[PDB]
Amino acid sequence: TRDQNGTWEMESNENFEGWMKALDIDFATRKIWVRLTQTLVIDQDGDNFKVKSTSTFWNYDVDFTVGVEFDEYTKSLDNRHVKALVTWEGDVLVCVQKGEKENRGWKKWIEGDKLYEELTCGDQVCRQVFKKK
Numbered sequence: 001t002r003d004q005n006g007t008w009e010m011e012s013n014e015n016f017e018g019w020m021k022a023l024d025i026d027f028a029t030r031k032i033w034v035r036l037t038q039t040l041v042i043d044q045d046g047d048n049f050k051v052k053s054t055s056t057f058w059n060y061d062v063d064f065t066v067g068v069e070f071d072e073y074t075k076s077l078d079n080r081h082v083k084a085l086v087t088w089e090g091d092v093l094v095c096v097q098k099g100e101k102e103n104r105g106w107k108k109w110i111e112g113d114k115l116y117e118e119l120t121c122g123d124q125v126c127r128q129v130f131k132k133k
């Protein structure tokens with residue numbers, strides 16, 4: 001099940017703060033962001049993805065083509081330069097962001113009407129579940 005299209009409403013968020021600490025999010029912003037419910041909007045056609053991660057206090061959008069590396073600035077998250085690559089491992093969509101932090105990226109997959117993802121950085125893993133609106 002590779003079809004990740006949808007507007008995805010958060011149902012569960014685990015260890016979001018540990019992931020943010022690995023990224024060194026400034027502590028005041030981090031303490032606010034840990035409170036916030038996340039929404040993911042995913043538009044997917046062929047290899048082409050347009051993704052928007054939002055809450056009441058952040059906006060983070062990224063467009064990418066599966067299989068095509070891209071230089072990326074992480075902008076509104078942690079303002080770092082990485083070399084990003086998104087690929088399929090079966091029906092798990094896997095992003096690796098090569099740069100300063102180790103083990104950085106995410107894994108995203110579908111279970112029925114739910115979207116599951118892991119956000120990774122350093123030794124930290126944040127686990128999230130969303131439901132298709």
Ligand SMILES: *C/C=C(\C)c1ccc(-c2ccc(N(C)C)cc2)s1
Pocket residue numbers: 033051053058059060062076077106108119
């Ligand atoms: C396909 C999934 C992607 C591109 C993302 C999943 C989570 C993301 C994210 C979470 C939180 C923030 N901030 C600014 C707290 C930014 C991006 S992107």
